[PDB]
From Swiss-Prot:
Record's subcellular location: Nucleus; Golgi apparatus; Cell projection, Cilium, Flagellum; Cytoplasm
Family: Belongs to the cullin family.
Tissue expression notes: Widely expressed, with highest expression in brain, spleen and testis. In the testis, it is mainly expressed in spermatids.
UniProt source species: Mus musculus
Subunit structure: Forms neddylation-dependent homodimers. Component of multiple BCR (BTB-CUL3-RBX1) E3 ubiquitin-protein ligase complexes formed of CUL3, RBX1 and a variable BTB domain-containing protein acting as both, adapter to cullin and substrate recognition subunit. The BCR complex may be active as a heterodimeric complex, in which NEDD8, covalently attached to one CUL3 molecule, binds to the C-terminus of a second CUL3 molecule. Interacts with RBX1, RNF7 and TIP120A/CAND1. Part of the BCR(SPOP) containing SPOP, and of BCR containing homodimeric SPOPL or the heterodimer formed by SPOP and SPOPL.
Chain spans, region Disordered: 2-22
The protein's name in its UniProt record: Cullin-3
Post-translational modification: Neddylated. Attachment of NEDD8 is required for the E3 ubiquitin-protein ligase activity of the BCR complex. Deneddylated via its interaction with the COP9 signalosome (CSN) complex.
Amino acid sequence: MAAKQGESDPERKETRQKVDDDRKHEIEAAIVRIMKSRKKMQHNVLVAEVTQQLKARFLPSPVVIKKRIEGLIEREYLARTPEDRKVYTYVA
């Protein structure tokens, strides 16, 4: 039989396709900044504001916004009024 050697060296096995994010974060910070100064704001009003405040870069959709806010309320960040659900209230 025969063993023989070769030329080994490269074996990092790296890719680097998705390290960090931002698209699903920039919209989250916008809602916090507004709710901090506005305190109380409706759903549409909050969406129309954030959706318009983040147009210079990309075209965000209420979709991610509705989901992002849904998490804040559970994270003791935002809240809803007893009268209507569409209405929100800062509680952070």
